[PDB]
């Protein structure tokens, strides 16, 4: 259901369906297995949306507040995602260009679509 | 010479204390600081400043040594909205002249007789 709304260009309705996947695995998974791979896909793709559309503190939930303090899941890909939330808060045009070159094999091409639309809306 | 001191403020404050114990044409200069430069994130903000250059002279103040070519392509989008409603645009007329002159010289930098690109056997045809 998250692969539909990014074809349908519903990037704000796409934040509603990613916080519902993560609220069940802390009730059912804590992670196991089958539920351990559902939580890798949902904390790499809720970070590429809050820089795409950067919500105001009224409509920023207490679940969205927790994940952005940790940055400002594999050890290869956990290190390049703390570095990308910093640059768009510093508006660093040279920092964002060398990371898509070095995060293209890491993601899959559903997560490769959300990183393309951030680098344009900051440049 | 680099920008590293102005990026990290806390590192630069600690090393200075170590040693010592031991308006017409005024408007033209302010817009150069973000255009004759390497690259910025001011693009929607960079495009509006070039508009009220006095419009008799765009090419003298756009076609120069190093103007940001990422300030030339979003310059084309904002001068269209003026034309879609109303009067002809000094943003969009004089920046069609700048776009197509840089296109020719790179093809002038290209060789004469073109051979087809082949990613399977690239150097096998010739020393082209």
Query: B2, B7, B41: best mutation site toward chain A, by most A Cβ within 10 Å?
Result: B41
**Is B31 exposed, middle or buried (CB count within 10 Å of its CB: 0-12, 13-18, 19+)?**
middle
C-alpha to C-alpha distance for B76 and B44, rounded to whole angstroms: 11
Residues near A112 by beta carbon (within 8 Å), at least 6 away in sequence:
A104
**B43 interface with A at CB cutoff 8 Å:** yes
C-alpha to C-alpha distance for B75 and B62, rounded to whole angstroms: 11
Q: Which one, of A73, A106, A100, lies nearest residue A87 by Cα?
A: A100
Q: H or E stretch including A95?
A: helix A93-100
Q: What does DSSP assign to residue A99?
A: H
**B77 interface with A at CB cutoff 8 Å:** no
C-alpha to C-alpha distance for A21 and B58, rounded to whole angstroms: 54
Concatenated DSSP letters for chain B? --SHHHH-HHHHHHHHHHHHH--TTHHHHHTGGGTSSS--S-SHHHHHHTTTS-SS-SHHHHSSSS--TTTTSTHHHHHHHHHHHSSPPHHHHTTHHHHTHHHHHHHHSS-SS-----SSSSSSS---
Question: Count of residues for chain B?
Answer: 128
- Interface A–B counts its CB contacts (< 8 A) at 10
- The torsion region of residue B117 among left (phi > 0), alpha (psi -120 to 50) and beta comes to beta
Q: What end-to-end distance do the CA atoms of chain A give, in Å?
A: 29
Q: Say if CB A36 and CB A69 are below 8 A apart.
A: no
Task: Say yes or no for a CB contact (<8 Å) between A94 and B41.
Answer: no
Report the gap between the CA of B4 and the closest CA in chain A (Å).
13
Task: Say yes or no for a CB contact (<8 Å) between B40 and A93.
Answer: yes
C-alpha to C-alpha distance for A119 and A23, rounded to whole angstroms: 29
Contacts of A122 in chain B (CB under 8 A): 41
Residues near A41 by beta carbon (within 8 Å), at least 6 away in sequence:
A21, A111
Q: Say if CB B13 and CB B43 are below 8 A apart.
A: no
Q: Say if CB B35 and CB B50 are below 8 A apart.
A: yes
Residues near A69 by beta carbon (within 8 Å), at least 6 away in sequence:
none
**B41 interface with A at CB cutoff 8 Å:** yes
Q: Entry resolution in angstroms? A: 4.0
Q: What does DSSP assign to residue A53?
A: S
b/e map A54-72, b = 16+ CB within 10 Å: eeeeeeeeeebeeebeeee
Concatenated DSSP letters for B83-106? HHHSSPPHHHHTTHHHHTHHHHHH
CA distances from A105 to A48, A95, A111, A115, B25 (A): 16, 18, 11, 13, 51
**Is B39 exposed, middle or buried (CB count within 10 Å of its CB: 0-12, 13-18, 19+)?**
middle
For B44, the closest chain A residue by CA position comes to A123
**Is A25 exposed, middle or buried (CB count within 10 Å of its CB: 0-12, 13-18, 19+)?**
middle
Contacts of B70 in chain A (CB under 8 A): 123
C-alpha to C-alpha distance for B63 and B2, rounded to whole angstroms: 27
C-alpha to C-alpha distance for B76 and B99, rounded to whole angstroms: 9
Q: Count the alpha carbons within 13 Å of A77 in the hemisphere toward its beta carbon.
A: 16
**B40 interface with A at CB cutoff 8 Å:** yes
Report the gap between the CA of B7 and the closest CA in chain A (Å).
9
C-alpha to C-alpha distance for A101 and A115, rounded to whole angstroms: 11
């Amino acid at each position: 259901a998250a692969s539909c709304q990014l074809l349908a260009r519903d990037y704000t309705g796409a934040l509603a369906v990613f916080t519902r996947m993560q609220r069940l695995a802390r009730e059912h998974g804590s992670a196991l297995g089958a539920f351990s791979d559902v939580l890798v896909r949902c904390e790499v793709s809720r970070v590429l949306l809050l820089l795409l559309l950067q919500p105001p503190p009224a409509k920023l939930l207490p679940e969205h507040a927790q994940t952005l303090e940790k940055y400002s899941l594999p050890e290869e890909l956990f290190l390049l995602l703390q570095s990308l939330v910093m640059a768009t808060h510093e508006k660093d045009t040279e920092a964002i260009k060398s990371l898509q070159v070095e995060m293209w094999p890491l993601l899959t091409a559903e997560q490769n679509h959300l990183l393309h639309l951030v680098l344009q809306e900051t440049i | 010479s680099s920008g590293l001191a102005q990026r990290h403020q806390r590192l630069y404050s600690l090393l200075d204390r170590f040693r010592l114990s031991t308006d017409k044409d005024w408007y033209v200069h302010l817009v150069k600081s973000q255009c004759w430069t390497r690259s910025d994130s001011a693009l929607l903000e960079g495009a509006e400043l070039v508009n009220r250059i006095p419009a008799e002279d765009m090419n003298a103040f756009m076609m120069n040594s190093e103007f940001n070519l990422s300030l030339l392509a979003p310059c084309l989008s904002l001068g269209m909205s003026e034309i879609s409603g109303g009067q002809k645009s000094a943003l969009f007329e004089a920046a069609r002249e700048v776009t197509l002159a840089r296109v020719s010289g790179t093809v002038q930098q290209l060789p004469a007789v073109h051979h087809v690109f082949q990613p399977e056997l690239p150097a096998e045809p010739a020393a082209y």
